[PDB]
Design a protein around this ligand. Sequence first.
Ligand SMILES: [Ca+2]
Ligand SMILES: [Ca+2]
Ligand SMILES: [Ca+2]
Ligand SMILES: [Ca+2]
Ligand SMILES: [Ca+2]
Ligand SMILES: [Ca+2]
Ligand SMILES: [Ca+2]
Ligand SMILES: [Ca+2]
Lengths: 204, 204, 204, 204, 204, 204, 204, 204, 204, 204
Amino acid sequence: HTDLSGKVFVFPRESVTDHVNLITPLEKPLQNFTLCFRAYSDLSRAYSLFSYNTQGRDNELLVYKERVGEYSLYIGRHKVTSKVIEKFPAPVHICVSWESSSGIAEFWINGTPLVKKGLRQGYFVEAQPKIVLGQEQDSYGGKFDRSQSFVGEIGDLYMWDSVLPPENILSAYQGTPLPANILDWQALNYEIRGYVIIKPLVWV
Amino acid sequence: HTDLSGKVFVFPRESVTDHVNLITPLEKPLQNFTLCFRAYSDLSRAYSLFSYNTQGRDNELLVYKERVGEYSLYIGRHKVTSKVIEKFPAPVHICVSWESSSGIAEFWINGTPLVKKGLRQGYFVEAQPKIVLGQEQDSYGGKFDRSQSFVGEIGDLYMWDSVLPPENILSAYQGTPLPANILDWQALNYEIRGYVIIKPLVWV
Amino acid sequence: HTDLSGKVFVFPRESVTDHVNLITPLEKPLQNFTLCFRAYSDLSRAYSLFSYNTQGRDNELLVYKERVGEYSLYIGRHKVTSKVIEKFPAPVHICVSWESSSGIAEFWINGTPLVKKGLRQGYFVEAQPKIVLGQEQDSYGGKFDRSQSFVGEIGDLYMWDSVLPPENILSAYQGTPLPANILDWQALNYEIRGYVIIKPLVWV
Amino acid sequence: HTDLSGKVFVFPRESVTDHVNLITPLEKPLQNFTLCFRAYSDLSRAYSLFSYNTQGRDNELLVYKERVGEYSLYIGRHKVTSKVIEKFPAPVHICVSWESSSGIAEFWINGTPLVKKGLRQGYFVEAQPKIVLGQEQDSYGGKFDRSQSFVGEIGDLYMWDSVLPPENILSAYQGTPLPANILDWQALNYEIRGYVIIKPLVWV
Amino acid sequence: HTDLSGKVFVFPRESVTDHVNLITPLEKPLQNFTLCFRAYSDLSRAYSLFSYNTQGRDNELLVYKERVGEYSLYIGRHKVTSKVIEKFPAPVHICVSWESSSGIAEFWINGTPLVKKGLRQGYFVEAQPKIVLGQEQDSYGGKFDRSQSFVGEIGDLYMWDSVLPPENILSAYQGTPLPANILDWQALNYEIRGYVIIKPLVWV
Amino acid sequence: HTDLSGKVFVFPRESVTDHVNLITPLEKPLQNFTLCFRAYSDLSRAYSLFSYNTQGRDNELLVYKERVGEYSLYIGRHKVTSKVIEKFPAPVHICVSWESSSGIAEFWINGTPLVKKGLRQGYFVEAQPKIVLGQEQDSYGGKFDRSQSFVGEIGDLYMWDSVLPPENILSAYQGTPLPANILDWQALNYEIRGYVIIKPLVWV
Amino acid sequence: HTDLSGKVFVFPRESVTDHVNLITPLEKPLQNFTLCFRAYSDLSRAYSLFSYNTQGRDNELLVYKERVGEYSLYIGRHKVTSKVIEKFPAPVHICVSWESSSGIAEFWINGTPLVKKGLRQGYFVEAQPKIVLGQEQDSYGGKFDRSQSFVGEIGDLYMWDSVLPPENILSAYQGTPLPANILDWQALNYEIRGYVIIKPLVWV
Amino acid sequence: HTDLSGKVFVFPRESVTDHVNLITPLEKPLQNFTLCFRAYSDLSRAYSLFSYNTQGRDNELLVYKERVGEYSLYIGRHKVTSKVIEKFPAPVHICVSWESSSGIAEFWINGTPLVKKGLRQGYFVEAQPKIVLGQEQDSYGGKFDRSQSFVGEIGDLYMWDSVLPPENILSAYQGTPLPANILDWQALNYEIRGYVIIKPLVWV
Amino acid sequence: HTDLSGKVFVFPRESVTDHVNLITPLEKPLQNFTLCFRAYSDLSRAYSLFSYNTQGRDNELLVYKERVGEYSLYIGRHKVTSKVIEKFPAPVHICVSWESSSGIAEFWINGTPLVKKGLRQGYFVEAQPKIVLGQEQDSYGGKFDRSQSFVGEIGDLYMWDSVLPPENILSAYQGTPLPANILDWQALNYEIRGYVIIKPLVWV
Amino acid sequence: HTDLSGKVFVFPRESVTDHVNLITPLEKPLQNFTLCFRAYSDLSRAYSLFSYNTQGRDNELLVYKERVGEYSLYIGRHKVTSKVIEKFPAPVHICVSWESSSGIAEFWINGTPLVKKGLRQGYFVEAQPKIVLGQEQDSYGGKFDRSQSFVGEIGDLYMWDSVLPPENILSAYQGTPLPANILDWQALNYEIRGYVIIKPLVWV
Ligand SMILES: [Ca+2]
Ligand SMILES: [Ca+2]
Ligand SMILES: [Ca+2]
Ligand SMILES: [Ca+2]
Ligand SMILES: [Ca+2]
Ligand SMILES: [Ca+2]
Ligand SMILES: [Ca+2]
Ligand SMILES: [Ca+2]
């Protein structure tokens, strides 16, 4: 595992090929979770930000940006969509949390709460995943789509197994995130495939 | 009755199912009233904020959002609509007051006064009502419409049987409202139906 | 005569009947004059602010709003128009002065001066008029048009027999106006017709 | 010679006759120069600000507005056009300089330099001119266009026989200009023909 | 080697002939670089800022502007494009970096980093260049296009044979740049051909 | 008394001065009427076809066209408006009837009937009138607006004192109308002022 | 008992008062029905062609036009709509057929079948109604809307107690309709309230 | 089997219920096929004409209309799309063929050939299907989507297990198609489920 | 003089150089005159068809196509315009007449008369000209504008010194040209300078 | 050589792969030529119709469609574009002929001639080419652009080494082509690479 503090993945071109595979020791199905990251991209079209897929289950947990100012979370095939006023193009902090008990999805865009939505209440998101940046999975770790590929910069990725409160969300955005127990940027297990470069984060 | 301080009703999906029934000790005809609440919704279409139907009469008192910037009030089937500059999506604090003797409707958005309109001078909204949040009523307690459903977050709801002065309306917006006698958030008799969850209010 | 300080004429509904008659101690033809008042309405179509009609003479003096950000002045059937940047909807302070010798119509919105216009050099505006508020006059005190009817909140109406210099115009905008000779808000002779209520001024 | 300190020219109507002639005692071929003035108009269509014509040749020196945000200078029939972001309507202050040795047109809207242009290198603007204000010359002091006329206010017009360096440019805008030699607003020789009045400058 | 500190190349008209040739001491193939300059123009259409061609190789290194808010870097015929929010017209500061080893192309606009792109990894830009301003090359030093011509103001041009850290980019932006070895505006060898003037930089 | 068969009244330039005064010796208060004419005009803006004004009264009878395919009638200040599908530009034949008692307006464009409209029941249009071809009146023979001026060709103007039946209107459309008792084209007492020329009909 | 062959109801103006009350000897609940009529109107906005209401039941039977090319039919508060290519404005022949057993509504425009719709299977429309023309009913005989008023020409109105087959539809459109037994234009019981006239049918 | 000559299936309303199950003697997997039917619908949105699904294979064979003048055939999940000029709404005759050896899809709209497209060369469409009309399956016989439902009329359905040449396709269009051996309208087996009525074909 | 019957001058490319000089044996100043020619050009932007310039006189007589379906005739600098229905792009025949005593210019596009227009009533154009085809003149025989170059095909160019009657205009269109007195296509003296080719007329 | 009489190449999908190579024994530079074919496609975007590349030479003889109603020819990198009224989508016969002596590019669409254009006067198009259908060469035989690929049907391709007179172009379109010396459809040497099927021509 690597300390990626002050660095970002750069997905420098539109492709069916460039991705980073995120390795996790998660053997337990997910009930609660929070996911945080920082994105910079000037893509007009729809792209995937974070693709989490299990065997036989496509789109198990997916953060997808369908268009400017519109953020989508997919749990177990089902989706929710929340809107927001945002400048284009701009760097963005994104935190999404979901909760099996309440079904509640919680988007935070730059430490600002989006409208809460709800999906898949009681659903247990399956374990032993394949997580990928830069590409949207249609298979277990494969079947990428070019017109869905991410091009731009991603960093400060943290993933917890619990619903973070507003303070802790604001902590991540302000630059001091609680040590995360599923995916931790400062101790990250990644695999680069194709054209992706690690560079200093300068748009912060 | 329950203390709902620092909590909201969240209507996480669009449906014809989800609503919240509000129960009020009111056995009295409404000469004067003021109704206040905090809403937060990213709907482009039209929706209902507060549905007040009585015994055979539809839309006896109704607060309806026709589009962005356009807040309507219905008294006994009759309509008044006042416009305002607002950002979308964005949280809003609505107050609406009505007087019988003058017919004057008074809309207040985020502590700012809207253009006065008038309707049903020398009339009274009927007693023993069925009050629902999250859907619009075409019957006494039912007949909901999907394209009228509220999906988002409502909180800090109060209803007085008086026309609250500007200072008092401002005090509700500032987060310290005066105890109410019809509907009170700090003592609300409610009934959840379908999919509505109580989460802490995070957008203030 | 009655003191209307901190109170406004609200025209709460679109109508063809509801208006307010103003009878002034005017017995001499007008050479120089200034009309100043406050208005708050979310009406989007054309409407009349101040109608001044005499026997056999149409629109001898008319303060008219064609659209948003465009204020017209009719003097003896002649027409002048000036544009300005303004928010909609938003309360406005309208001031209009006209000189006979130079023909110069002066327009002031929110204390800011608009482009000087000119009309009817060496012309006397008629005496013994019938002044209505909330409606437009096609005949001597009657013949209203429903699509020209003002619906909103008018207030602080003042009229002088002299062309007001800039310092005095600003004085009117702050809320400390100079003693008016023709029409005064603190001493007004008015006739109420149809639906028109007098409520306190809140939008200032 | 007339002192016009704190005064403006108003052309109060769309006309074909209203113009202000300006006499200048200079009878030398023009090498370098600078022209500053102020203007307050609400015209959507094109209009001529300043017109400088000699015997037998059209547009020896014409400052022309094409539309909102576009300003043009003519040097002997030849044209240059520079753009800027501006409010409409809004009072404007235009300084322009043309150097014969370099052809450099230097536009300054409200003390901000617009992109420098170039035209007619090694050319002399002709002596014995007829300068008009409020109209556009097509013959020597005649042949006017109704669709090019100026309606609005004009003041603080000063003309030097040198290219005024950016420091002195600002001095003019701030209200305290260098004493001019070609045309002085403090000591002007002008001629009113038609409907155009003298009024004090109220819009600064 | 002339100190052009506080002066700008002004391309005053649209032409297919007017350009400036920059001579560089560079006979080691380019591997890494930074390019910084200021640009003031009101052109709506597409235009080249900087053209670097070698024998038999078109668009070896080209900084090109498709439209407002869109900047393109060309390396070895290949292209990347990044987007920005920018006012028009407005004085702009540009730095672009490139680094064969990673292929990352790094655009900075007025001190703001755009989205990093990537082109030609393992490629080195040919030496023995002919560098032009004000025109776009389609051959070795010639073949100009009138629709591609740059009209406006260019100053404070610098070029380094290294990728500049974020710091040094801002050092350049705020008018105290680092010593450059390829192209130095304080010691630039240049040839003016056709119509292009040197005048003081007054929009900073 | 002048035979105008195969002749038109070309209004060749847009103006404020050029008008043709149509005089009739009918001193009877008009009960029923019909009016025919051909016209040719490539004006996209609004204009007046036929103006009728009396003592102290505006637009007692008026045939006005707001926009392509829209024709409107005015009787004693009141309006009616009917639409039709036409080409542009298009040589047009227009006839209109008004039966006082039924108050019915009968537009007959190009031999095809329009949707009937109703105005001023129990009304008789006045006598001793001033009728103008080529301008729009807002006074007794005066007050003309350039933006209401007609420019183009007008021909075959006939006018009867009774409401013409369908069969009779068709006859007029062919080019063989019945003898008119008020306004005969084969016997028209007219008056030319300014630029308006006679030329043979070539379009029909 | 009135033979209105070759005659129409002309509703000549927009109003809240003008209508025709249709009286029918139908005192049995309606299982099947066919309604045909001709209408000429250049109205752009939504209006009501045929209004049929019963005791305490709104919109029992209603032919309503939402816009150009869109035709609606209401059977007991329930709605169905069907679209058609049509010239605007133009005269139209409408046929609507309803059949309770299947629910199938059948719209025939100018003798052309629209797409078949369905509503209220096994339902009987109420007996003993009030039928109005020219206005829309919100109550039993009254409660009209100006923004729903019909203006134009209606004729050849027939209503049968059975579902009419094509040949008979084409017969009605052709001009020789089969004898009707609810409403018969050739022997109609009509009542004019307000401004509606009877004029010849000319537009066929 | 049922003879459906001169009759249509009418889908009277937007639903997630109303479907016709079609049943067929196909137990050999499809290699070649032609499909023809007549549809009449005013539905603006996307809908399925013909849905054919096998165990665990969705959209095995599907004719789907995305928008106006756009027809799509899906074979084995893959799709092809061809465009056509067509009036809306209007009755349409669709033919579509597919040939496995070439992979060519052939569309015919009103006897006119569209652009040939190719997909799934060498593929066999699976036997033992579920064919539904009115709805679009996502499961084997079920899981319908409301916004994909067909409302309108379908008739003259025929399916062969061969690729028909133009003559036969143009014969099918004209009215006399040759005995079809997969689905044959003149000997059809069907299950009506929900709201769908059999009514005579009136629009051909 | 050479025979050009069934032959055309083609202007194959946009240029600032390609033109056709037309020399005429005309020392007589034009009083009444008519000019006819055929054009085939797919140019969207404005262009000149027929430039006629005299010593020290710009645009003495000039046919200038402003845009599609818009033909302008310049006479002695002054401007008239007429619009017409036409297909783009399409071969066109344009006849233009003008009468000195009338100022009436008549346009005949393809044989249809356009709206008569008037200018310079009482003017005679100068003799000793320089007629150019393909270019717009700014001086006596030169100073071309590239944005006005005519690129396309011109055939059957004729010019008479008399106002041709409608029947002779229609003869000219059909290819039966009356013997020309000024400019004859069957016997034209011409000078070709630049890139312009002679081809047979194939688009009639 | 193969007799492709009555057959087409169907390029059934968008690819960067599928193309037909055309093989001719051409060994001498082409002074003149005529190329004709039938094309059917619903492609909205730009595409190549016929790419002809020699060694080291790109776009030597290219027919390329930029958009609807706009046909282009490239000779030695240089281009011409001629526009045409056409329906989309629609089958089309294209004939292009270029003449070196004159430079004349002549385009024929469905027998109708477009505006003649001109390029590369005196040029000779190189021998030993590489002729492809379905794609667009950037190199000698390859370097395809998907965003430029042809997808549709293509047939009746014939190429002569002469410039055809109108009667032979017409005869080609009518279906009886003059025998061709370079490329003959009735004896074609082709190379299919990828996915292109031969189907019988049905759209004529
Ligand atoms: Ca009036
Ligand atoms: Ca001029
Ligand atoms: Ca280049
Ligand atoms: Ca007028
Ligand atoms: Ca109703
Ligand atoms: Ca010229
Ligand atoms: Ca010119
Ligand atoms: Ca190429």
